[PDB]
């Protein structure tokens, strides 16, 4: 196996096609990273050549991506969060976010009180929809059955467990609280 | 929504029911409601012969 | 050193109640929204203003009742005998520009531009004598060039007191002599004062006479600048038609 | 003086201005030689990308931080150049210097023609370079190292940046020299530094000032600078290969 | 953080009062809030309280070389500062358009009036001369910061006492309060500021306004005028448009008021000197009100220093001695040595080549 | 090529070159205008104590109860049914921000915009994501003012076929008081190009759209014979706008015809402009008179 | 274009820092130092109504509006 | 999760570094590499790299005691060593890391300013020692101190002789002398967990989760110079006496390091 | 900023040797240089290349020679950027641009043969003349480098340097004695003071004197410093795009020719302005 530097001659436009993290010019395929040479033959010949480091220290979010987050503060009409994991991998730094009062449920309905949906200190799974404005930058959404708070935390520091679609109960003191439970 | 002169209820509803002069009032201006209109139906067409409102 | 001879003539040859020669101009720059240029005696000033615009930064620093006047001051490094270069952190420029912001927050009829900024810039190319009144008059002319409405035509002049007499339009030689200097900012129609300054000691009996001589010298500046404005407006009316 | 540092003497004249040993004579050499260079990538552990470049009497350390929050539709590229006080004949003021800002801008206008910022909307990259020792051509090291750091940190660029340096002899028959040293740089009349992309064959940055006024010397200075940037490339070719072989084998 | 906002009921309440010519705390138009001075123990230190405002003044001198030109005088720094505790709003770098006008008011008053005698503060010329440096701090903001700051600076400067020196031939010597007695200063006059506020477009005025009255006012007029009958500075500011009879009325008012204030200051300094000379006890400590719940007094107390030897001895004796695994240093090549678990090979070589 | 270097010349005041006396009434701030029993203040004046005091330099214009002063330098003020031209400077969640030389910014609502397709297909929240894609930063539109807000702000709409994003051409910015009010601000001058005389001071010059909303890019080379016409109109517009002349179709056509004899590159001199402005002045005098 | 061999400063700057009986005794951890839960169902397997899905399929199938 | 995960290793008595909770990292140094400085030394502590450099200049003695030569330390934390430092004026951590070294230099009396004067009252030597951190992993005040002490053992000054009629300074650059060093202060840092656990040689993550920190520096004759406790949980006399027993061994280790590297030249 | 369609139209026009003003790919708009505008200084200039506006001033003062060489003076530049030129230049914000221009000017003038250095020393190791060049940006309308490198040669041509004949002898009056004549000065021999020439690249063609709109459509540029004799002093590449080796060689010829014509025509205009002296009055800012 051989690795790459972000430019070299790899293949012709007839002997394959550019993939992820590559660019082409003057009929040749040129590398754009320092990772490893992977050629996904797939099916139909003409492999889509690409270079991937496979050791992601940082990765910029996209228009559509699954991210694991951590709520920082909540407001009556929005809830600022902190992106913590981009899908699976840990993130070296922390960006910022904002959950508007339209992305809680998968219907974009009225009612939907934000206060009992995203209590601070939780960890949530959400999806981006846009690159946002200068006030709110990523505009995450949870309008799905698989998205929502996944691992909550008690009032007095005890790991929580899901109990229903809309209601949660304390295991120790048997206290009832409201969340937005996501599918496991 | 009801856009009658003396009763105004839900002016942003999907379906608006109004007297005729309101339609010309919102047709003189833009009002950004003509873009999302699919059907416009008239209930009494026999006022073309009206001597003062035709 | 003699600052007033027995005959009554000053160092430069003018009497007590005599002004210097002013030579103005309207419409100096093209890119900006207003301009002016005045040379009061041997002091050369310059002023540039920018019209009501969107507030820079948009950091929620607006006033919902009036506009935001923002005036700066700068000075060329060859404006006096010695070089005397200064950084843009000196407290003399900030305090003079703060008195400028104070007098133009009172002269301009500002409750007509909600959520708007007014940027006023003044540049002094050669300073010899009263700098404050030259900057005020140059920025009044630049604001007039920009078409900004105001209650009246604010004008400023200084005065002094040597050997029992009141001077007018003091110079740098006379200023750097330890005397009771004093400056106003007058609205000619009402006689009101927008700003008052003084320094060094002076007995209370001669304050009325120094203030009156300063107000009269400001009313004398008013006529001379008024003829310049009238000639400019008649010029543009002639140009139009 | 400064309220955020330890205050010592108000004035301090270094002993070089009292050094009674008269300035010596540099010597002579062959102008068709290059100082051997050793390059290492991935040095620092807490930095997203880093590189350390040393050749002869030059010591420069470069580290690259990852993208952070805050021509958009495009990302910025912040830069910061700073050299160690214990470098050169005399000490330097910690607060800064106009020379540092000029070289920082001469770096910024040279590493942006390589990376493609049309892939990082609303983000920004920050690059920090430090010179531990000044023993020759410096701007030919702050370019190579800050490009190696970028390549080992996994940001997407069109190509690398390889720098060189030259100087003009002061004799009656001046001739340009390659990789000058402080003994051959403080006695020179002019200097030139080029930034060439070796594959794309495009000059990235140019800077030169001095006493050479005939437009026939600068053609050779430029083209021998291009030959230097095409001769330094293989070492940087094997350096990133070893860097990636070790990083991948570390998993 | 910011300051509580102003309602629309307080404005109305202050203005119906002011129209009717009666104020909240009872004092009529031409009155001051009574004053209360307190002296430290080392010279040039005082605490003035005007109403409920506090300022701390402290003078201090030091010996430097006198620039170039003006070889036979001394310099006089000043630095006003506004303490975060004066009021919620004051913030170290977010109130930079009051500091300037305040420092300026203070400096123009104190340094242009020529009341301090900076002539006779030299030791040699071209050589070391005394450089005094006044310092004031605002502690509690309740309106009229500048009157209190001026009275504070006056008292602090009229209570200082320098060191003193012997100069004869070409030889210096520096004494100390035991070798030679500290010496007072020379003060020609006492310039004291006064402020006036104007209400609803100059129709009414109020002497010595506080901070609420300060938020319902158009503009301010300050008139600094030393003793005798000699005015020293005036500075109209704020939002005011003034007449000419009014400046004269104000000058009269400042004359009267500065007369009374100078009476008070002179009496207080004399009483303080009398106390210091009688031989009684002075200082910040013997100023705390004793008829008040928040003061308590305790003479000295040996606590019991009878046991510390025993405790220390048993503690030192009762703990584990240093252990005895000693480590070895490894030598690679002169210049570099390593201690710890070490590295396997002698040094890396051709690891990847 | 010689890089001519002339020397500055002192300006001649009073406009003695033609000679006219004004019959108007001129005022300056502080002057007391007529103070009869009952009058209404206009824009440019204010009231003191039983006095109508002018507050800006200009000439009084009264229509039958109304004293007002018309200044000669102001910023654009919005009015209903006024053609404007602007540029996008901010793209927000539900709006754009457009700069049109006014005291504030102008808002283009998403509800009023001819989306690609030009017919009734749909309008929902899916379009909100791509609205910030096509109307990006620094683009040119040509819309019509809808209404006046409560703080001098203006809302402008694009509900027609002639309005929308513009294409190739050149832009010339002048003061927003030299454009003459008319009923047709769109022109198709018989020279080889067109023009839009924006009432806010934006002059846009573009070639004629061959035969026959921003849907078409048409980023193909423009013929040589069209650039020379656009450059000629650009220089002529600068020439007419500078000294006094009020701008409209006939003045530009007249100067364009007057500009044929000598080259387009050489007209930047103070005197060639004068010999063209005077010729247009006298041609207008012998045609209108 | 010959590459060269390192020197002390570089070979020490590039250092990778990656039971065997007991030492440093005092610094061990042992020497220095009812819950009846009645837990509910452990997860909630969502086997039940999940309103969003209800309202969507409800209206689409229903398709009556009367 | 955060606290419990680490306490799993604490109860296991083997922290994730692979250490027995009472041992230090691997230590290595080099001296004499920067040839543009009077003296320099590089200190590596299994990351936490710190480099120091010494430059000697001339300066006027102070007005009070004109027989002293100044020594000025400074510690700088550039935004490249870590990712939490931002550009601009020096921050609180580097300023405290400089005030601590200044206090150590003063209290320890390692050098005497009377040994630097050439002619009393006119000119005195001045030493500018600036520390720049190449890597921040934890225990900053230990490696900065060791870098400074190692550097001060290599700085060498030339013999300067002043004329009488000329009264200038003629530097003899051939015969170069050394510096007189009295003591050898070495610091040691402890990190205290929630209320009872103390560890040696902590790490940035551990300091991120710890609740206190203690630093102790010892002479070569068992004398304490400073007792730096920024604050936290709280300790007892027995725990301090336990810490000093380890610090004695650490000091013997370090003093053996310095006693061995200098002999090797 | 300008839209993408405007940039496409402009680049196509440049490729067709047509521009929005009407000039060609190498034409140069006129300028209005003048001298002797400021009184208190010892030399002045005022360059107007278009919407831009420059004003400089040179003051000669007494000083001390530097350590490296005693028979020399030195030059100090300070390019101020007044905030009246543009509102975003308010207070802080014009510092980086001023430093960029000052360092470039220092690199231009950092040579032994720039004008002279023997003339500015009077007593070795004890005294020398110092020159204060004070640039003041009044307006910005593009091509600022050439509009400043022209006002610097212009102001340098108008220096006075009042002659001082004071004897340095200790027995004599060592303290500097002037000539006491208020109108006794000496010229400066500025014949070969270099100037900067900018060459913006758009498409695959290079354009002289690009406007702000034409500058926004360009990706790179090169600066050349050429004297009247035709020699190069400094060479700095500024821009945001690559350039290619060939275009350097084909831009050097245009830089040489434009520099030679610029220098010859500036010598001709300055001699024309100087041929008639106290006549012709002086008009500026009024």
UniProtKB/Swiss-Prot annotation, chain A:
Alphabetical list of InterPro entries matching this protein: Csl4, EXOSC1_C, Exosome_cplx_N_dom, NA-bd_OB-fold, S1_domain
Residues modified to Phosphoserine: 17, 94
Main location: nucleus
GO molecular function: RNA binding
Domain of life: Eukaryota
Transmembrane segment boundaries: none
Name by which UniProt lists this protein: Exosome complex component CSL4
Lineage: Eukaryota, Metazoa, Chordata, Craniata, Vertebrata
UniProtKB/Swiss-Prot annotation, chain B:
Short motif (DEVH box): ranges: 43-46
Signal sequence segment: none
Cellular compartments annotated: Nucleus; Cytoplasm
Outcome when changing residue 44 to Q: Abolished helicase activity
Annotated family: Belongs to the helicase family. SKI2 subfamily.
Related illness: Trichohepatoenteric syndrome 2: A syndrome characterized by intrauterine growth retardation, severe diarrhea in infancy requiring total parenteral nutrition, facial dysmorphism, immunodeficiency, and hair abnormalities, mostly trichorrhexis nodosa. Hepatic involvement contributes to the poor prognosis of affected patients.
Assembly and binders: Component of the SKI complex which consists of SKIC2, SKIC3 and SKIC8. Interacts with HBS1L isoform 2.
Function in brief: Helicase component of the SKI complex, a multiprotein complex that assists the RNA-degrading exosome during the mRNA decay and quality-control pathways. The SKI complex catalyzes mRNA extraction from 80S ribosomal complexes in the 3'-5' direction and channels mRNA to the cytosolic exosome for degradation. SKI-mediated extraction of mRNA from stalled ribosomes allow binding of the Pelota-HBS1L complex and subsequent ribosome disassembly by ABCE1 for ribosome recycling. In the nucleus, the SKI complex associates with transcriptionally active genes in a manner dependent on PAF1 complex (PAF1C).
UniProt-recorded name of the protein: Superkiller complex protein 2
Organism: Homo sapiens (Human)
From Swiss-Prot, chain D:
Protein's UniProt keywords contain rRNA processing: yes
Cross-referenced CDD domains: RNase_PH_MTR3
GO cellular component: cytoplasmic exosome (RNase complex); cytosol; exosome (RNase complex); nuclear exosome (RNase complex); nucleolar exosome (RNase complex); nucleolus; nucleoplasm; nucleus
GO-annotated molecular function: RNA binding
Cellular localisation: Cytoplasm; Nucleus, Nucleolus; Nucleus
Alphabetical UniProt keywords: Cytoplasm, Exosome, Nucleus, RNA-binding, rRNA processing
SUPFAM superfamilies found in the cross-reference section: Ribonuclease PH domain 2-like, Ribosomal protein S5 domain 2-like
Region of interest (Disordered), ranges: 1-34
Family per record: Belongs to the RNase PH family.
Quaternary state and interactors: Component of the RNA exosome core complex (Exo-9), composed of EXOSC1, EXOSC2, EXOSC3, EXOSC4, EXOSC5, EXOSC6, EXOSC7, EXOSC8 and EXOSC9; within the complex interacts with EXOSC1, EXOSC7 and EXOSC8. The catalytically inactive Exo-9 may associate with the catalytic subunit EXOSC10/RRP6. Exo-9 may associate with DIS3 to form the nucleolar exosome complex, or DIS3L to form the cytoplasmic exosome complex. Exo-9 is formed by a hexameric base ring consisting of the heterodimers EXOSC4-EXOSC9, EXOSC5-EXOSC8 and EXOSC6-EXOSC7, and a cap ring consisting of EXOSC1, EXOSC2 and EXOSC3.
Protein name as it appears in the record: Exosome complex component MTR3
Source species of the chain: Homo sapiens
Gene name in the database record: EXOSC6
Swiss-Prot record, chain H:
Main location: cytoplasm
Superkingdom as given in the UniProt entry: Eukaryota
Keywords: Acetylation, Cytoplasm, Disease variant, Exosome, Neurodegeneration, Nucleus, RNA-binding, rRNA processing
Keyword Protein biosynthesis set for record: no
Pfam families: RNase_PH, RNase_PH_C
Keyword Nucleus recorded: yes
GO cellular component terms, semicolon-separated: chromosome; cytoplasm; cytoplasmic exosome (RNase complex); cytosol; exosome (RNase complex); fibrillar center; intracellular membrane-bounded organelle; nuclear exosome (RNase complex)
Intracellular or extracellular location(s): Cytoplasm; Nucleus; Nucleus, Nucleolus
SUPFAM superfamilies: Ribonuclease PH domain 2-like, Ribosomal protein S5 domain 2-like
InterPro entries (alphabetical): ExoRNase_PH_dom1 (IPR001247), ExoRNase_PH_dom2 (IPR015847), ExoRNase_PH_dom2_sf (IPR036345), Exosome_comp_Rrp42_subfam (IPR050590), PNPase/RNase_PH_dom_sf (IPR027408), Ribosomal_Su5_D2-typ_SF (IPR020568), Rrp43 (IPR033196)
GO biological process terms on file: exonucleolytic trimming to generate mature 3'-end of 5.8S rRNA from tricistronic rRNA transcript (SSU-rRNA, 5.8S rRNA, LSU-rRNA); nuclear mRNA surveillance; nuclear polyadenylation-dependent rRNA catabolic process; RNA catabolic process; RNA processing; rRNA catabolic process; TRAMP-dependent tRNA surveillance pathway; U1 snRNA 3'-end processing
GO molecular function per UniProt: identical protein binding; mRNA 3'-UTR AU-rich region binding
Record-stated family: Belongs to the RNase PH family.
Protein name (record): Exosome complex component RRP43
Organism: Homo sapiens (Human)
Taxonomic placement: Eukaryota, Metazoa, Chordata, Craniata, Vertebrata
């Amino acid at each position: 196996v051989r690795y790459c530097i972000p430019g070299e001659r790899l293949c012709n436009l007839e002997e394959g096609s550019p993939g992820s993290g590559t660019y082409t010019r003057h009929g040749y395929i040129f590398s754009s990273l320092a990772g490893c040479l992977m050629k996904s033959s797939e099916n139909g010949a003409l492999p889509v050549v690409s270079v991937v480091r496979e050791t992601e220290s940082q990765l910029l979010p996209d228009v559509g991506a699954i991210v694991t987050c951590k709520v920082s503060s909540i407001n009556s009409r929005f809830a600022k969060v902190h992106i913590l994991y981009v899908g699976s991998m840990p993130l070296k730094n922390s960006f910022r976010g904002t959950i508007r009062k339209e992305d809680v449920r998968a219907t974009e309905k009225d009612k939907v009180e934000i206060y009992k949906s995203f209590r601070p200190g939780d960890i949530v799974l959400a999806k981006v929809i846009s690159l946002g404005d200068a006030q709110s930058n990523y505009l995450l959404t949870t309008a799905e059955n698989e998205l929502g708070v996944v691992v909550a935390h008690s009032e007095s520091g005890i790991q929580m467990v899901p109990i229903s679609w809309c209601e949660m109960q304390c295991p120790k003191t048997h206290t009832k609280e409201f969340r937005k439970v996501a599918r496991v | 929504g009801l856009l009658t002169g003396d009763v105004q209820l839900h002016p942003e509803a999907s379906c608006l029911i109004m007297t005729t002069e309101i339609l010309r009032s919102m047709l003189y201006s833009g009002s950004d409601v003509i873009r999302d209109l699919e059907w416009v139906i008239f209930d009494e067409v026999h006022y073309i012969n009206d001597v003062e409102r035709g | 050193l003699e600052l007033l001879s027995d005959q009554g003539y000053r160092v430069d040859g003018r009497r007590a109640g005599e002004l210097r020669k002013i030579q103005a101009r309207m419409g100096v720059f093209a890119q900006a929204d207003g301009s002016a240029y005045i040379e009061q005696g041997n002091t050369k000033a310059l002023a540039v203003v920018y019209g009501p615009h969107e507030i820079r930064g948009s950091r929620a620093r607006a006033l919902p009742d009036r506009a935001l006047v923002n005036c700066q001051y700068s000075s060329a490094t060859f404006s006096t005998g010695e070089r005397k270069r200064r950084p843009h952190g000196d407290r003399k420029s900030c305090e003079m520009g703060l008195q400028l912001r104070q007098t133009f927050e009172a002269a301009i009829l500002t409750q007509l531009h909600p959520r708007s900024q007014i940027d006023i810039y003044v540049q002094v190319l050669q300073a010899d004598g009263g700098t404050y009144a030259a900057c005020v008059n140059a920025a009044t002319l630049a604001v007039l060039d920009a078409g900004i409405p105001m209650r009246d035509f604010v004008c400023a002049c200084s005065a002094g007191f040597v050997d029992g007499t009141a001077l007018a339009d003091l110079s740098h030689v006379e200023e750097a002599a330890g005397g009771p200097q004093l400056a106003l900012a007058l609205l000619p129609a009402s006689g009101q004062i927008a700003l008052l300054e003084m320094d060094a000691r002076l007995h209370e009996d001669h304050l009325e006479r120094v203030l009156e001589a300063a107000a009269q010298a400001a009313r004398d500046v008013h006529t001379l600048l008024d003829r310049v404005v009238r000639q400019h407006v008649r010029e543009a009316s002639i140009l139009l038609g | 003086g400064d309220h955020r540092r330890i205050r010592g003497p108000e004035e301090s004249q270094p002993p070089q201005l009292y050094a009674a040993d008269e300035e010596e004579a540099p010597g002579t050499r062959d102008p068709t030689r290059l100082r051997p260079v050793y390059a290492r990538a991935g040095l620092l552990s807490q930095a997203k990308g880093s590189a350390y470049l040393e050749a002869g009497g030059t010591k420069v350390l470069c580290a690259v931080s990852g993208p952070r929050q805050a021509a958009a539709l495009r990302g910025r590229l912040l830069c910061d150049f700073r050299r160690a006080p214990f470098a050169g004949r005399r000490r330097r003021a910690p607060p800064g210097g106009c020379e540092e800002r000029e070289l920082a801008l001469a770096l910024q206008e040279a590493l942006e023609p390589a990376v493609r910022l049309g892939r990082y909307p609303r983000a920004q990259l920050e690059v920090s370079a430090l010179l531990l020792e000044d023993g020759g051509s410096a701007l030919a090291a702050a370019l190579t190292a800050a490009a190696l750091a970028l390549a080992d940190a996994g940001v997407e660029m069109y190509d690398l940046v390889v720098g060189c340096g030259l100087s003009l002899a002061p004799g009656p028959a001046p001739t340009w020299l390659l990789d000058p040293t402080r003994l051959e740089e403080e006695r020179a009349a002019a200097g030139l530094t080029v930034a060439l992309m070796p594959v794309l064959n495009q000059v990235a940055g140019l800077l030169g000032s001095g006493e050479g006024g005939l437009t026939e010397s600068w053609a050779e200075a430029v083209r021998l600078g291009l030959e230097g940037c095409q001769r330094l490339y293989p070492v940087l070719q094997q350096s990133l290969v070893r860097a990636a072989r070790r990083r991948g084998a570390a998993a | 953080m910011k300051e509580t906002p102003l309602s629309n009921c307080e404005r109305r309440f202050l203005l119906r009062a002011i129209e009717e010519k009666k104020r909240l705390d009872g004092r009529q138009t031409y009155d001051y809030r009574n004053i209360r001075i307190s002296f430290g123990t080392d010279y040039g230190c005082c605490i003035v309280e005007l109403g409920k405002t506090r300022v701390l003044g402290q003078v201090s001198c030091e010996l430097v070389s006198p620039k170039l030109n003006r070889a036979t005088e001394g310099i006089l720094f000043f630095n006003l500062e506004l303490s975060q505790m004066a009021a919620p709003a004051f913030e170290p770098g977010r109130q930079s358009d009051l500091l300037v006008k305040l420092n300026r008011l203070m400096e123009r008053c104190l340094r242009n009036s020529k009341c301090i005698d900076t002539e006779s503060l030299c030791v040699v010329a071209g050589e070391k001369v005394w450089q005094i440096r006044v310092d004031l701090h605002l502690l509690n903001h309740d309106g009229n910061i500048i009157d209190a700051a001026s009275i504070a600076a006056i008292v602090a400067l009229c209570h200082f006492r320098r060191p003193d020196v012997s100069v004869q031939g070409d030889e210096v010597t520096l004494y100390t309060p035991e070798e030679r007695d500290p010496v007072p200063l020379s003060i020609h006059h006492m310039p004291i500021c006064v402020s006036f506020a104007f209400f609803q477009q100059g129709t009414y005025l109020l002497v010595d306004p506080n901070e609420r009255e300060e938020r319902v006012m158009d503009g301010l007029l300050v008139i600094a005028m030393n003793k005798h009958r000699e005015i020293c500075t005036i500075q109209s500011s704020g939002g005011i448009m003034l007449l000419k009879d009014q400046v004269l009325r104000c000058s009269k008012i400042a004359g009267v008021k500065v007369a009374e204030i100078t009476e008070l200051i002179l009496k207080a300094l004399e009483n303080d000197q009398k106390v210091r000379k009688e031989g009684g006890k002075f200082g910040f400590a013997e100023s705390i009100a004793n008829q008040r719940i928040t003061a308590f007094k305790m003479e000295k107390a040996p606590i019991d220093t009878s046991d510390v030897e025993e405790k220390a001895e048993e503690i030192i004796a009762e703990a584990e001695p240093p252990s005895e695994v000693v480590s070895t240093p490894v030598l690679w090549t002169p210049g570099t040595a390593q201690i710890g678990e070490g590295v396997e090979n002698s040094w890396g070589d051709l690891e990847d080549s | 090529m010689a890089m001519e270097m002339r020397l500055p010349v002192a300006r001649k005041p009073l406009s003695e070159r033609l000679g006219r006396d004004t019959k108007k009434h001129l005022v300056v701030p502080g002057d007391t205008i007529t103070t009869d029993t009952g009058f209404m203040r206009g824009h440019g004046t204010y009231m003191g104590e039983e006095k109508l005091i002018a507050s800006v330099a200009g000439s009084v214009e009264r229509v039958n109860k109304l004293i007002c002063v018309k200044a000669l330098k102001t910023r654009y003020i919005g009015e209903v049914g006024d053609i404007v031209v602007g540029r996008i400077t901010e793209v927000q969640q539900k709006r754009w921000k457009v700069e049109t030389n006014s005291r504030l910014d102008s808002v283009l609502l998403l509800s009023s915009m001819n989306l690609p397709g030009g017919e009734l297909r749909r309008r929902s929240a899916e379009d909100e994501l791509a609205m910030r894609g096509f109307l990006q930063e620094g683009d040119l539109i040509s819309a019509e003012v809808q209404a006046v807000f409560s703080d001098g702000a203006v809302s402008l709409h694009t509900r027609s076929l002639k309005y929308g994003k513009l294409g190739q051409g050149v832009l010339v910015q002048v003061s927003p008081s030299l454009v003459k009010r008319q009923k047709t601000h769109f022109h198709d001058l018989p020279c080889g190009a067109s023009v839009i005389l924006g009432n806010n001071g934006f002059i846009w010059i573009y070639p004629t759209p061959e035969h026959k909303g921003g849907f078409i890019a048409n980023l193909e080379p423009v013929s040589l014979a069209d650039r020379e016409v656009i450059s000629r109109l650009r220089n002529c517009i600068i020439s007419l706008v500078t000294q006094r002349m009020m701008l409209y179709d006939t003045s530009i056509l007249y100067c364009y015809e007057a500009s044929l004899p000598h080259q387009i590159k050489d007209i930047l001199k103070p005197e060639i402009m004068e010999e063209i402005v005077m010729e247009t002045r006298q041609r207008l005098l012998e045609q209108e008179g | 274009a010959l590459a060269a061999r390192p020197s002390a400063f570089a070979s020490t700057l590039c250092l990778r820092y990656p039971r065997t009986l007991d030492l440093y005794k005092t610094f061990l951890y042992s020497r220095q130092v009812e819950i009846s839960p009645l837990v509910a169902i452990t997860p909630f397997d969502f086997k039940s109504a999940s309103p969003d899905d209800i309202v969507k399929a409800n209206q689409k199938k229903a398709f009556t509006r009367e | 999760e955060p606290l419990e995960y680490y306490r799993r290793f604490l109860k296991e008595n083997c922290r994730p570094d692979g250490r027995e909770l009472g041992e230090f990292r691997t230590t290595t140094v080099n001296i004499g590499s920067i040839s543009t400085a009077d003296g320099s030394a590089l200190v590596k502590l299994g990351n936490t790299t710190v480099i120091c450099g010494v430059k000697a200049e001339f300066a006027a003695p102070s007005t009070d005691a004109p027989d002293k030569g100044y020594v000025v330390p400074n510690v700088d934390l550039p935004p490249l060593c870590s990712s939490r430092f931002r550009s601009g004026p020096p921050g609180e951590e580097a300023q405290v890391a400089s005030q601590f070294i200044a206090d150590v230099i003063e209290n320890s009396q390692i050098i005497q300013k009377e040994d630097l004067c050439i002619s009393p009252g006119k000119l005195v030597w001045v030493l500018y020692c600036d520390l720049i951190c190449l890597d921040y992993d934890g225990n900053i005040l230990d490696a900065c101190t060791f870098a400074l002490l190692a550097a001060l053992k290599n700085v060498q000054l030339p013999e300067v002789t002043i004329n009488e009629e000329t009264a200038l300074a003629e530097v003899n650059l051939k015969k170069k002398s050394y510096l007189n060093i009295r003591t050898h202060p070495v610091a040691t840092s402890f990190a205290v967990f929630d209320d009872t656990l103390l560890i040696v040689d902590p790490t940035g993550e551990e300091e991120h989760l710890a609740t206190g920190t203690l630093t102790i520096v010892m002479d070569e004759e068992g004398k304490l110079c400073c007792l730096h406790k920024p604050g936290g949980s709280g300790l007892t006399g027995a725990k301090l006496q336990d810490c000093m027993s380890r610090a004695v061994t650490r000091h013997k280790e370090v003093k053996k390091l310095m006693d061995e590297v200098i002999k090797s030249m | 900023t300008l839209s993408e369609a405007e940039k496409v139209y402009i680049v196509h026009g440049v490729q067709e040797d047509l521009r929005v003003d009407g000039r060609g790919c190498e034409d140069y708009r006129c300028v209005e240089v003048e001298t002797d505008v400021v009184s208190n200084t010892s030399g002045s200039a005022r360059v107007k290349l278009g919407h831009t506006d420059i004003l400089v001033g040179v003051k000669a003062e007494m000083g001390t020679p530097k350590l490296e060489k005693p028979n020399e003076g030195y030059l100090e530049f300070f390019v101020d950027c007044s905030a009246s030129a543009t509102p975003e230049f308010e207070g802080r914000g014009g510092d980086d641009l001023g430093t960029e221009i000052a360092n470039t000017l220092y690199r231009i003038f950092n040579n032994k043969s720039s004008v002279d250095l023997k003339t500015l020393c009077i007593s070795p190791r004890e005294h020398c003349w110092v020159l204060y060049v004070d640039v003041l940006l009044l307006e910005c309308g593009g091509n600022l480098f050439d509009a400043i490198s022209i006002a610097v040669k212009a102001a340098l041509f108008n220096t006075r340097i009042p002659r001082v004949r004071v004897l340095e002898d200790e027995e004599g009056s060592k303290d500097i004695e002037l000539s006491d004549d208020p109108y006794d000065c000496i010229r400066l021999s500025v014949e070969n003071v270099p100037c900067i020439v900018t060459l913006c690249k758009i498409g695959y063609r290079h354009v002289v004197d690009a406007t702000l709109q034409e500058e926004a459509c360009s990706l790179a540029s090169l600066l050349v410093s050429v004297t009247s004799k035709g020699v190069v002093t400094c060479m700095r590449k500024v821009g945001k795009g690559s350039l290619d080796p060939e275009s350097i060689f084909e831009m050097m010829e245009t830089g040489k020719r434009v520099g030679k014509v610029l220098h010859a025509s500036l010598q001709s205009v300055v001699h024309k302005e100087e041929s008639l002296g106290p006549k012709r009055q002086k008009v500026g800012f009024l």
